[PDB]
Design a protein around this ligand. Structure first.
Ligand SMILES: [Zn+2]
Ligand SMILES: [Zn+2]
Ligand SMILES: [Zn+2]
Ligand SMILES: [Zn+2]
Lengths: 86, 86
DNA sequence: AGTGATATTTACCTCCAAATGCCAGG
DNA sequence: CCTGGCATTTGGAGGTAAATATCAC
């Protein structure tokens, strides 16, 4: 059900039904503002087993499915956990 | 039911006792007004669903007799404060 | 190193008890 | 005007969603 691997998902993460591996991958990439390189055509297949093959095409898929970078906490919300008051 | 006072169906505890909806209002409206009741007879009058309105004094007498509390009725400041308290 | 599972943290959402009030009838 | 059935509030137990940090491999 994970919108990127097809692996098992149990809840929405950053606005998309995602697995627990992509959730952790998306956060670290956005938190460290990391940059990747696709050694291939700039498009690599991403499924459960090959998700850890081209990190670039993986993150390219996280955006294409709509994971919002700004949900990854920062500023005076750095290290704040749980639901937000609203 | 379970009403300690008259024996009708009892929904939950009221002022310390598992009481009626009728005995709830009768106790509340009295302590609100602080009205004094008179029993024209022995001070022993029967109490059940069909005959609870016959003697007001005895109905209130039985209310204190089964442990209903005057302190729980809200007056002074909590006049109207609804629901449970912090 | 990253990866991914796991635990900690938050704040709503629904019951649910028990307080108040407000009328439709007797 | 007295009765009592119904409605409107409070807040705490208990569960859920979705942020985080914390590791073992
Ligand atoms: Zn996934
Ligand atoms: Zn690629
Ligand atoms: Zn009763
Ligand atoms: Zn009497």
């Amino acid at each position: 059900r994970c919108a990127v691997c097809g692996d098992n998902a149990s809840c929405q993460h950053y606005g998309v039904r995602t697995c627990e591996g992509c959730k952790g991958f998306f956060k670290r990439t956005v938190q460290k503002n990391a940059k990747y390189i696709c050694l291939a055509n700039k498009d690599c297949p991403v499924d459960k087993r090959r998700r850890n093959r081209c990190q670039f095409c993986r993150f390219q898929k996280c955006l294409a499915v709509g994971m919002v970078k700004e949900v990854v906490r920062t500023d005076s919300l750095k290290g704040r956990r749980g639901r937000l008051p609203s």
